[PDB]
Amino acid sequence: VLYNFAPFFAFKCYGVSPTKLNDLCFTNVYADSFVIRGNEVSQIAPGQT
Amino acid sequence: VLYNFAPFFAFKCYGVSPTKLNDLCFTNVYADSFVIRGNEVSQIAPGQT
Amino acid sequence: NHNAQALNTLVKQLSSKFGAISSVLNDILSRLDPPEAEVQIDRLITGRL
Numbered sequence A, B: 001v002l003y004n005f006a007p008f009f010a011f012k013c014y015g016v017s018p019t020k021l022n023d024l025c026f027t028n029v030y031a032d033s034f035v036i037r038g039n040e041v042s043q044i045a046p047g048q049t
Numbered sequence C: 001n002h003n004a005q006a007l008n009t010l011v012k013q014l015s016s017k018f019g020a021i022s023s024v025l026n027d028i029l030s031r032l033d034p035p036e037a038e039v040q041i042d043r044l045i046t047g048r049l
């Protein structure tokens, strides 16, 4: 249902595949929300500077 | 500062990572500029026809 | 001579890229971000092993 809340094109999932997210259990989930600009979207990823 | 001059979304770097570009020295750099259309942007890459 | 030649061959094997961008770990670490660099380091590790 996350696709119904925001008009984003696709997930960018690391260590897991989005289509499998409904088959798993997690101890806790954290949703971190903010606003950046287009150039900086690539910096939201492991190993970025 | 290249992100401030043009509204491009991201680099497409081959043989190097953009975030490391500030940690390196190069003997010479070449900037080749032109205009193509959207279909042909994928042809600006090694091994393309 | 056989033992010395075996050791010399083992030493000279360190100059092989094994499909990586470079045969030097420091160059790989400097030119790439951690996630991409892990792949090249894995290739070198497999070759040397």
Ligand SMILES: *[C@@H]1O[C@H](CO)[C@@H](O)[C@H](O)[C@H]1NC(C)=O
Pocket (backbone or CB within 6 Å): A004, A005
């Ligand atoms: C967002 O919440 C408002 C009320 O807070 C509601 O009227 C609106 O329909 C909601 N939109 C979506 C896409 O859920």
Ligand SMILES: *[C@@H]1O[C@H](CO)[C@@H](O)[C@H](O)[C@H]1NC(C)=O
Pocket (backbone or CB within 6 Å): B004, B005
């Ligand atoms: C481009 O150069 C012009 C003058 O040649 C200047 O007025 C303008 O601010 C510059 N724009 C950028 C984004 O550097």
